[PDB]
Amino acid sequence: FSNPFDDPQGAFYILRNAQGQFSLWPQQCVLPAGWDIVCQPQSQASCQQWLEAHWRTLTPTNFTQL
Amino acid sequence: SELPSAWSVAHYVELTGEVDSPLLARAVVAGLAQADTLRMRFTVWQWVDDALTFELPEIIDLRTNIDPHGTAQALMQADLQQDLRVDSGKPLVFHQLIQVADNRWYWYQRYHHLLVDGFSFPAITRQIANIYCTWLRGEPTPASPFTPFADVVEEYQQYRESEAWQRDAAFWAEQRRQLPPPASLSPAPLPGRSASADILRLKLEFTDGEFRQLATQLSGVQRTDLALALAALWLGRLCNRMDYAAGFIFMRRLGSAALTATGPVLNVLPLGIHIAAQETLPELATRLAAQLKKMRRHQRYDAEQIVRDSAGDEPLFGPVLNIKVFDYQLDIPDVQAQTHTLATGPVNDLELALFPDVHGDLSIEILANKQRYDEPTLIQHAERLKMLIAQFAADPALLCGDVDIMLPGEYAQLAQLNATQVEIPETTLSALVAEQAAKTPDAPALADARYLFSYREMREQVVALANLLRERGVKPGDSVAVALPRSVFLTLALHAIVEAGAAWLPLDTGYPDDRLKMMLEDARPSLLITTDDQLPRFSDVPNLTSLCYNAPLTPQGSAPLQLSQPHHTAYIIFTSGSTGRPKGVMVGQTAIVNRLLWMQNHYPLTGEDVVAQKTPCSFDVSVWEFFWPFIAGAKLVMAEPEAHRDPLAMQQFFAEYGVTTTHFVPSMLAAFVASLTPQTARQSCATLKQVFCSGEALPADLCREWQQLTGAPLHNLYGPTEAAVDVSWYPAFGEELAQVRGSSVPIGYPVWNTGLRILDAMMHPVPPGVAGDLYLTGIQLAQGYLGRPDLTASRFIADPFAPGERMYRTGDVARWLDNGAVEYLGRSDDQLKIRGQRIELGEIDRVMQALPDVEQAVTHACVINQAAATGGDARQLVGYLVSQSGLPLDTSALQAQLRETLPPHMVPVVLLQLPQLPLSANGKLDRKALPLPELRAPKAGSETIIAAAFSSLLGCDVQDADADFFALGGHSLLAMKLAAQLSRQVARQVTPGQVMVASTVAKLATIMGFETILPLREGNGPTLFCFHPASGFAWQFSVLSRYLDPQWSIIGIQSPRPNGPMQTAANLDEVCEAHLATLLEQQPHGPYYLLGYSLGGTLAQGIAARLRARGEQVAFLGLLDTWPPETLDPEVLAEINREREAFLAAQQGSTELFTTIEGNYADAVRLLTTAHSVPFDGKATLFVAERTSPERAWSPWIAELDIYRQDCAHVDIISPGTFEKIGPIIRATLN
């Protein structure tokens, strides 16, 4: 409804920038510049399962250095 | 039904050539007489009177006028701007014939709108011309081509009784079922009808040749269906609505029946238009053309019929798309005929006709309401269509969702609004606070009711605690949870955590233990800072180190530790998640530094400003309350706990410290203004120099009501937690407030190094005034969600306008205003903002669907009672349950279970069980069918006044106790008016927080240490002992603490009842040596610091000498207007009576068990009659009231007397205003 990211039936790329940050991108939109495609379009819960296993540097003790 | 509108259609045929004028006029009467529909008559009744006649048109000769054309227009306008009668048999037809030249004629024609329409009037003009031409050949008058009015009426009754009807009815019944809501190119609401028949006509020919090239690439596409596909896309894109209802011109009569009819014929019917973003222009042109074909098989159906089976409510459609062309051609021998249109009729919104010519080019005709549109903004929209077409002529494989409808001058205006680049230093919070502390080390910085720190003193305590945190294993990059009451040590703790290079995690102790443990298991902080009282709650939390911080530490220098780095996390604020579990927002160090440096640049603070700390630490608004005053030199003052909920306690708090800067939530500002009178508004809010509102939509009417009371500048700020406090700003006072047209103050312009986007579903920008999805870019974005990469990648998305950068998805719907400011419009998700509290309805539903035997559960926000809708946000959380077994659920016991999981504000106030969840034909849960909750030991005799107070505010008679204040429609804003109303009806004070913990008639009706030792302020270093006066309580020494060095402890000792030193002593030396037991045990060896006042003065001067029998030294002995007992005596009983009068007047008349107070005075009088002053050779300090011989009267009982003068009485020498001068003297003497 309304926002294309709130669509539970939508498919989403998983993108990654130079700083190792991950962004979902809806399949129906033109891909943004500066981001690499990591995963092909998956489900809302499939993206949730991939992100929880490949992006675990998201704690305040991980921003302690760089 | 009702007599119709009386607006007419007007046109003139411009004839060029030799015209037989008195013959053509005679041909008009002959033509009009043939059509018996033009003899229609209204009298309510509507019928045809064939006894009506037509008069010859009056011929007018303007060839000898100074301006033949201009005068001819005025003539036709003078008849057109007159209201037609519709009454009488007066035929509603009028023709003219104005002669402009020898060869040029203006043939004016006017008809009532119920006689002809835009399609049928050329039939009458052509028949009059046929009669005219036929006579010019010498032939008789031609027959009547029109069918009589009787035959067209039976034609309609032939219909409506057939199977085509009911079949057409079933089609347009299902059409309005899936008919989307209408759209409009105007930001104004859409009215049902429209008054003015004077409209705005606009004709535009596109000579760029782009449409010609578009149709030559789409050869198989019909040009009318292609042009219509363009308009359908053009309207949806400009309104940012892919589904909208439009109108379309059909015909109720077809074939010969339409060419023969006198009119009307046209039929405007609803048309649902869906714009699929992934489609190409041919596919949209195909589906749209195939959709009209199905509608044309039912176009004979009446348009006024769709309305009847559907006043001034919203209409069915907005824009009207016309693809038809009307034949105005006449053939008069050697005469050129050109029809010019004067009056088409009223338009409600916008009519758009498209004309692809024979050569392939494209012209459009725009008709618009003059109230909703103007000349230039239509040219601007029609320019967007010119580039719309051009982008498909370049690439016909372009998707309809990716087509660009924004002009080149609006991309530039967005490049100017986001030019917020400001170079800031690569610094941290600790470096900014240490910078200001070096500037003004002696200025006042932090103060509550028992403390006042200078900047140097504050940094000494912060570094002391930050070293203690390091000694307990807090390394840079860790989290520290904080569960502290609002005091100076709450502020110190946060600064100390940042000083150690760690991030702080604020905890609301009002949350249940199951949620705090869940929050602590997700953040996993290295240490928890709390008090000893809150400690037993965290015992069930495994692997968590505790630290009790409730007293100042020993200071060891103020040098900064330099452990903080800009890349570190500054703080973690938890919010509600739509999946059930809360989520933590980690805000970086650089993100909060930019927010504060802008705050100080845009709203400068100085050393005479007083910032208030009243926002609960859980809310990220407090973040700039804890640090912004310390990067500027201002003073930060701690409000009392539970005082942010009390407007009256807020008024006392503002006047007490002279607060200059504070924050408000619009619901609280509305409740604060409701408690204000102009007398109290200048007694508390007089020192306010600037006030900030955020968290909710700020009503402009409230700001004007706030500007009249105080005149203090008000500022609207907007931003989510993920964007470091606030992301935009807008003035809510002065000239900007008077120029606000909307209901709410705009959220404004971007702060430093911050951008705003407002995009559609395909991530393209939207033109001004059009609603879109609000996104945030810049240096102020959060690092992400703690432990939640799935949430981060979903809300912190890629930014297609800044390669590689990131962009936060707010979930807010917003639009651009003409001045560049952003206006908040609403949400796009199920997140609500109740009185400033961020609440996710998804979480509350997930917890209720986990309850025992619960099949379905729905949370809903509504106003239970309309008598409580006075100001602020009156919404309540109402939960609806469906049992899986069909058995009753006992909702009150389920409500108690929810309170052990959800925060108090997220717990529904009422739980109602439903047989079936009220779905609709869609299956999408109709929330308007959700039933609002309806409004036993009868009251009492004491709770009869409070039960009468509910009936006042709640507007409903409450007669039985255990009546929940909230379940009757009350809310925490109305509890402030409730507690303020009971405080006038009871001698005892009632705080709005007492209503919170116990909201019930009988439970609210049931609702300063009394021990030997009074712990006024427990510090670290030396202890100043204050002795009780004749009342037997050291309560009045509360105001001395703030004037002392924070290391000093202050322990007042007193005499309680029963079993008290004044009640049990026969001699005054029996009690004077009884306090030597309590004083010597806590300081077995001195030195000693003693203060007395009146009876406590002689009680200290006896101990000060009983200690000089020891053994230890007496460093400070202070006496507040004390006299030796050698000075029963009268007149001193009138003085100690004034001591009893003043002491009781400061208890607010609360309480009674306090016969102890007057009892102590009675046992004090009999104790003063056997008293005897002891030597004490040392030095003592005297404070004397000038308004009542202190030297010689004390001479042989204290060798040294330093003495100080104060203009007061013996009663007011202990007053808070007198300690304003006495206070600093004790501090200066004690060191």
Ligand SMILES: *P(=O)(O)OCC(C)(C)[C@@H](O)C(=O)NCCC(=O)NCCS[C@@H](CS(=O)(=O)NC[C@H]1O[C@@H](n2cnc3c(N)ncnc32)[C@H](O)[C@@H]1O)[C@@H](N)CO
């Ligand atoms: P009763 O038992 O209900 O008690 C009543 C009172 C008022 C005492 C109680 O409700 C209370 O203490 N309230 C204080 C609430 C508070 O301080 N809240 C923090 C403000 S919001 C915060 C971030 S947020 O994510 O929580 N909210 C962001 C969210 O809010 C909307 N919003 C913010 N600013 C807006 C403006 N100016 N106009 C319209 N909408 C605004 C947006 O939807 C946004 O997404 C802070 N960052 C806000 O400054």
Ligand SMILES: [Cl-]
């Ligand atoms: Cl809301």
